[PDB]
Amino acid sequence: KVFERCELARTLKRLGMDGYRGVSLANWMCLAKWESGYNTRATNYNAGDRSTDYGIFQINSRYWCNDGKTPGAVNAAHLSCSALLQDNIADAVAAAKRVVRDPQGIRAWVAWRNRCQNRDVRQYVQGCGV
Numbered sequence: 509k510v511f512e513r514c515e516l517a518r519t520l521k522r523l524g525m526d527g528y529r530g531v532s533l534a535n536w537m538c539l540a541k542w543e544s545g546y547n548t549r550a551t552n553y554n555a556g557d558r559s560t561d562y563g564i565f566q567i568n569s570r571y572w573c574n575d576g577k578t579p580g581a582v583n584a585a586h587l588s589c590s591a592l593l594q595d596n597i598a599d600a601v602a603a604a605k606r607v608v609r610d611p612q613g614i615r616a617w618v619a620w621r622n623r624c625q626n627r628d629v630r631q632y633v634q635g636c637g638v
Contacts, residue, residue: 509547509548509549509595510545510546510547510548511540511546511547511548511564512546513537513546513632513636514633514635514636514637514638516537516540516546517533517537517632517633517636517638518636518637518638519597520533520536520537520601521533521638523597523598523601525601525604525605526638528605528608529605529608529609529613530613531608531613531614532629533633533638534629534630534632534633535614535620535624535629536604537629537632537633538620538623538624538627538629538632539565539614539617539619539620539624540564540565541632542619542620542622542623542624543561543564543565543566543617543619544563544564544565544566546564547564548563548564548593548594548595548597548600549563549593550562550563550564550566551563551593552566557570557579558577558578558579559578559581560575560577560578560589562575562589562592562593563592563593563597563600564592564597564600565592565600565603565604565607565617566617566619567585567589567592567600567603567604567607569581569589570582571583571584572584572585572587572603572606572607573585573587573588573589573591573592573603574586574587574588574589575588575589575590584606585602585603585606585607587599587602587603591603
């Protein structure tokens with residue numbers, strides 16, 4: 509499922525993401541936008557280390573979800589990577605919460621540093637009613 513901007517905004521808010529561990533809703537929106545373009549079935553294989561990024565938040569198979577084919581994998585979120593490809597993003601949100609719960613925070617996603625950090629991110633939630 510490819511989410512519409514405000515539709516996603518309200519969903520994340522309902523799922524308790526606004527201000528989770530200091531991360532504003534606008535920041536989560538900026539992250540989802542650049543990671544997958546609000547697409548829940550987005551997958552990205554990293555040929556370099558044999559891991560795959562899954563779902564709307566492009567969560568990595570080496571540490572957060574288990575896909576069985578990633579070498580040296582650990583399952584920190586303890587979910588099947590398949591759960592992160594659903595239209596319902598409850599599990600993807602729970603995995604995202606687990607990721608930022610680690611010392612790097614939102615910085616864990618390099619895309620956030622490149623395209624969201626130190627920028628005006630209000631535009632991602634503007635007009636959405638959140």
